[PDB]
């Protein structure tokens, strides 16, 4: 199980750490931590074939410490990720999976 | 009338209970309990034919205790209800309308 | 200028009142009063020709005490709105436009 | 880095302020400030050809005080900005891009 703040503790509009590996079917916690809102959106133009990005997203703001939004990913490939909110920003994360 | 809690009094993420039977036309009541944020997805895949699953949704986060949404089903059958956040939790339940 | 309350002051999930008539362009104020969480959605089948349902509908939810929903309608009918959430509650409304 | 208000000081519902300049590239920020809930959606029938309203658009409610919402925009041209919420109150702005 492995686990992604959204926001850093100094306030940064990150996905912290940005960068993980799971293994397929292992548990993703998403746990909002700071500079809210957030959201999970996973990248149409980025996520393996067949993968429906639509439906593995959380597009819904995340306005509270502690919310946690639970996935769990099967496909092996890389995955983009990203928070519309901050966008612009540069909040965004890359998912390996295996 | 039948009450399902959003979250259990232990903070787990399920719907409480995770079973229900009710008659056709009995208001169901989704109380928001603990565990913040839900949602009720009524599943494509395993609602009755004829069932537009999106209208008898309710998809917008629910984040504070005490919220309520009631929803009557008509269309006798069984129903897969989850909860999008939580969906990789295991949060779903199934209602059986007679 | 008419106002709207979502939700009677002993909690009701009403539309207070659930008659109202306007003038065309006269403004339409919807103020979050209790039992949140409320949204403001036209009926598809219940507004009159020509009106987008979708454009005129707000259909994310208001949470808090106060928070305002403004609009203007222009097209002379009947207009069927409810409150998601609480559809199954009787929460709905008509708003007649002359 | 052009920053844009949502809500005024004296709880106006209005973008503060409802015109700003700004280069291809260049970050906006919009910080929620009073008279919630706010949203920023960009007008489909008054941004440059090519631009997807939709993707730049940010349609969840923002309900807290500093809140913010980052954006980048490089095609140049006026963009016409409102807030669903409050568009019968003439919650709207203009961005013009270089
Ligand atoms: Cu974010
Ligand atoms: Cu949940
Ligand atoms: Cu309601
Ligand atoms: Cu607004």
């Not at 959201?39 to 703001?61: K, M, Q, R, T």
């Not at 639970?70 to 965004?92: F, I």
């Amino acid at each position: 199980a492995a686990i992604v703040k959204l926001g850093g503790d100094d306030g940064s509009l990150a996905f912290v750490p940005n960068n993980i590996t799971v293994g397929a079917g292992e548990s993703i916690e998403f746990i909002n931590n700071a500079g809210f809102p957030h959201n999970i959106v996973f990248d149409e133009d980025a996520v393996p074939a067949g993968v429906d990005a639509d439906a593995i997203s959380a597009e819904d703001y995340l306005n509270s410490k502690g919310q946690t939004v639970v996935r769990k990913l099967t496909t092996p490939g890389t995955y983009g990720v990203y928070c519309d909110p901050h966008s612009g920003a540069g909040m965004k994360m890359t998912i390996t999976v295996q």
